Amino acid sequence: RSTLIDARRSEAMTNVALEMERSYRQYCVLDDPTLAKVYQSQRKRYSDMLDAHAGVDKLYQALRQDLNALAQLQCKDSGPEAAAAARLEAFANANTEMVQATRTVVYS
């Protein structure tokens, strides 16, 4: 079932995930509504790829929850809120796990 198109998608998801965290920390510094729109656009782009990544589970469910928990931008003293920052970190590690898991199933 899984082809390298699913591998390219895991690539692109982690790329958008880091772009999400970049926009999040940029927004908390500058407090600009346009950056918020970009962040939700990137979050929406990640959501769409996760849907296309359905199948290919535990790791899938956790990625969807982190995506939902990151829906609102909470800032505190020019940085993300502590709970928001912990979610961003967890979301990035689940994405790393997703790349590993995806790459084993596309070739074994």
Author numbering: 49 to 104, 108 to 159
What are the paper's exact sentences on this?
Here, we report that the outer membrane lipoprotein QseG functions as an accessory protein that directly binds to and activates the histidine kinase QseE via its C-terminal domain. QseEF, a TCS responsive to multiple ligands including phosphate, sulfate, adrenaline, and AI-3, is essential for the virulence of pathogenic Enterobacteriaceae. Notably, genomic analyses reveal that a third gene qseG is co-transcribed with qseE and qseF, encoding an outer membrane lipoprotein anchored to the inner leaflet via N-terminal lipid modification. Collectively, our findings establish QseG as an endogenous activator of the QseEF signaling pathway via a conserved regulatory mechanism.
To refine atomic modeling, we additionally determined the crystal structures of QseG37-221 at 2.1 Å and the QseE sensor domain at 2.4 Å resolution. Although the sensor domain of QseE is not annotated in InterPro, we observed that the QseE sensor adopts a four-helix bundle (4HB) structure. The QseE sensor domain consists of extended helices arranged in parallel and anti-parallel orientations, characteristic of the 4HB family. Conserved arginine residues are critical for recognizing small signaling molecules, a hallmark of 4HB family sensors such as NarX and McpN. For example, Arg54 in the sensor domain of NarX and Arg28 in McpN mediate nitrate recognition. Consistent with these observations, QseE contains two conserved arginine residues (R70 and R73) that may participate in QseG recognition. In vitro pull-down assays demonstrated that QseE R70A completely lost its ability to bind QseG, while QseE R73A displayed reduced binding, and QseE R154A exhibited no significant change in interaction compared to the wild-type. This result is consistent with our structural observations and sequence alignment analysis, which revealed that R70 and R73 are located at the interaction interface with QseG and are highly conserved across species, whereas R154 lacks both of these features. Structural comparison further showed that there were no significant conformational changes in the sensor domain of the QseE monomer upon QseG binding. QseE38-171 represents the periplasmic sensor domain, whereas QseE1-196 includes both transmembrane regions and the sensor domain. Cross-linking experiments showed that QseE38-171 exists as a monomer in solution, whereas QseE1-196 and full-length QseE form dimers.
